[PDB]
Design a protein around this ligand. Structure first.
Ligand SMILES: [Cl-]
Ligand SMILES: [Cl-]
Ligand SMILES: [Zn+2]
Ligand SMILES: [Zn+2]
Ligand SMILES: [Zn+2]
Length: 260
């Protein structure tokens, strides 16, 4: 327990981090398998009122927002979850820091919303069990406009700049931190992307991205400090080998362009 870029490598402290079915991975949409069984995601309870407040913590690995009870997420028949927390992965000034890549390209940042299967009462019961945990992931890109939903969190980072600091923030619409298109996504089975790197995690990566302003992306990557004397930057894991896994897509092929 640990900092990005630190020593020793994770398999030394958690051998499961050297498992064969780890996350994140590179997504090659042309090789993804279209599955018409994959229906639009169904969320309920994500529109939180201003009160009560939520814990926002700099844990030295990321900034993590604790979510209240009642956030329900359904991936499909037999696959229902409750949200626990969300956190972010980012780079540094001018440098991207998403965890997943698309055709080998890295995005500025990435949001993760971590969920527990309704089949398990506690995380430690679910760890390593196929389908026990599920993560919703979206890429954050630069856009021309300030993202008002993200500003609610970004504006509070300065007060938790030092590692281990926390603060309380107003409830907000958690779905406003995610893309609006719930119908188009990729899905595969992998791992937690931090120790203990437990496998059996269902990953769902939105096809649509979310946009933050340049200033906002800078605030995210420039404000927080990590363990020891370190800067909380480049807090993403290297891409992991697919090792024969299939990435499914909830939508068919389609061309990016067409001649007149
Ligand atoms: Cl394995
Ligand atoms: Cl490629
Ligand atoms: Zn640590
Ligand atoms: Zn390319
Ligand atoms: Zn994460």
């Amino acid at each position: 327990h640990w900092r990005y870029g630190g020593d020793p490598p994770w398999p030394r402290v958690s051998p499961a981090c050297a498992g064969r079915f780890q996350s994140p991975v590179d997504i090659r949409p042309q090789l993804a398998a279209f599955s018409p069984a994959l229906r639009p995601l169904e969320l309920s309870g994500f529109q939180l009122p201003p009160l009560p407040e939520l814990r926002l913590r700099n844990n030295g690995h990321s900034v993590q927002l604790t979510l209240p009870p009642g956030l329900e997420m359904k991936l499909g028949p037999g696959r229902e979850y409750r949200a626990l927390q969300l956190h972010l992965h980012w780079g540094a000034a001018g440098r991207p820091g998403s965890e997943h890549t698309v055709e080998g390209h890295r995005f500025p940042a990435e949001i993760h919303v971590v969920h527990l299967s309704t089949k398990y009462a506690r995380v430690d019961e679910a760890l390593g069990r196929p389908g026990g945990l599920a993560v919703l992931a979206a890429f954050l890109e630069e856009g021309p406009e300030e993202n008002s939903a993200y500003e609610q969190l970004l504006s509070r980072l300065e007060e938790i700049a030092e590692e281990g600091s926390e603060t309380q923030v107003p409830g907000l619409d958690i779905s406003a931190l995610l893309p609006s298109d719930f119908s188009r996504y990729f899905q595969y089975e992998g791992s937690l992307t931090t120790p203990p790197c437990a496998q059996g995690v269902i990953w769902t990566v939105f096809n649509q991205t979310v946009s933050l302003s340049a200033k906002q992306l800078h605030t995210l990557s420039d404000t927080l400090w990590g363990p020891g004397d370190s800067r909380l930057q480049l807090n993403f894991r290297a891409t992991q080998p697919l090792n024969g896994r299939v990435i499914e897509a909830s939508f068919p092929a389609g061309v990016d362009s067409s001649p007149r």
